[model samples]
Target chain A: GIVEQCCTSICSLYQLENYCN
Target chain B: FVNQHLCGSHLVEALYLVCGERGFFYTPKT
Candidate 1:
């Protein structure tokens, strides 16, 4: 399922890049 | 265009992977 591969969501953290590093 | 297949991935390789895929990828117009 796509839900199993992709991240949590794009709601609260949409475009969030802090977790990049 | 809200339902334009908004997919999300981590920042580490988000752009790299998203653009790597086959679709209309974007960041924002601002």
Candidate 2:
């Protein structure tokens, strides 16, 4: 889903490892 | 909280969609 991708991308961008995965 | 993060994501998603529809892109940090 686009929302999930957005969350993943944001998490990756901010280095929030496993935070939204 | 996750809710705050989700809210921010939704805002970004909406902006991305709107800008794309208008033939542009949104990248706030760039």
Candidate 3:
């Protein structure tokens, strides 16, 4: 889903947690 | 570990970029 993909991209760039809902 | 709240701005930008690239909103759906 879009949320997951968005979170994945964000995490990859910032080294953050998945945090997807 | 970093808090998710800190990523608020980045998250919005990321969503915009990802959705834009994938035409998630620009595509016409019926």
Candidate 4:
């Protein structure tokens, strides 16, 4: 239970969203 | 509308043909 620095953002080129924590 | 962490996990769907083949996608929680 370690290591963290996540990121997710993409809403272009047809739009898409499915990675956020 | 589309698809974690701890104790291990598995979920991958990648196919990037120069930002055309699904562009790029990834998810491997930790």
Q: Give the lDDT ranking, best first.
A: 2, 3, 1, 4
Q: What is the C-alpha lDDT of each candidate?
A: 0.34, 0.39, 0.38, 0.27
Candidate 2 clash pair list: none
**DockQ of candidates 1 onward, in order?**
0.06, 0.05, 0.12, 0.15
- What lDDT does candidate 1 reach at residue A2? 26
TM-score of chain A of each: 0.21, 0.23, 0.24, 0.14
- lDDT string for model 2 (A1-21, tens) is 333544434333333222222
Docking class of 2: incorrect
Candidate 1 docks with a DockQ of 0.06
Residue-by-residue lDDT tens digits, candidate 1, B3-30: 1233544432454543443333333422
For A1-21, candidate 1 gives per-residue lDDT tens digits of 222223333422334322223
Off by over 4 Å in 3: A1-21, B1-6, B21-30
Q: Would you give the TM-score of chain B in model 4? A: 0.17
TM-score of each: 0.20, 0.28, 0.30, 0.17
Model 2: residues >4 Å from true position, as ranges?
Answer: A1-21, B1-6, B21-30
lDDT of 2 at B25: 37
Q: Model 3: which residue pairs collide?
A: none
Alpha carbon deviation, residue B9, candidate 3 (Å) = 0.6
Please estimate how well model 3 matches the true structure, expressed as its whole-model Cα lDDT: 0.38
Sliding window of 10 residues with minimal summed lDDT for model 3 chain B: B21-30
> What lDDT score is found at residue B13 in candidate 1?
47
Q: For residues B1-30, could you state the per-residue lDDT of candidate 3 as single tens digits?
A: 323432346555544554554432321121
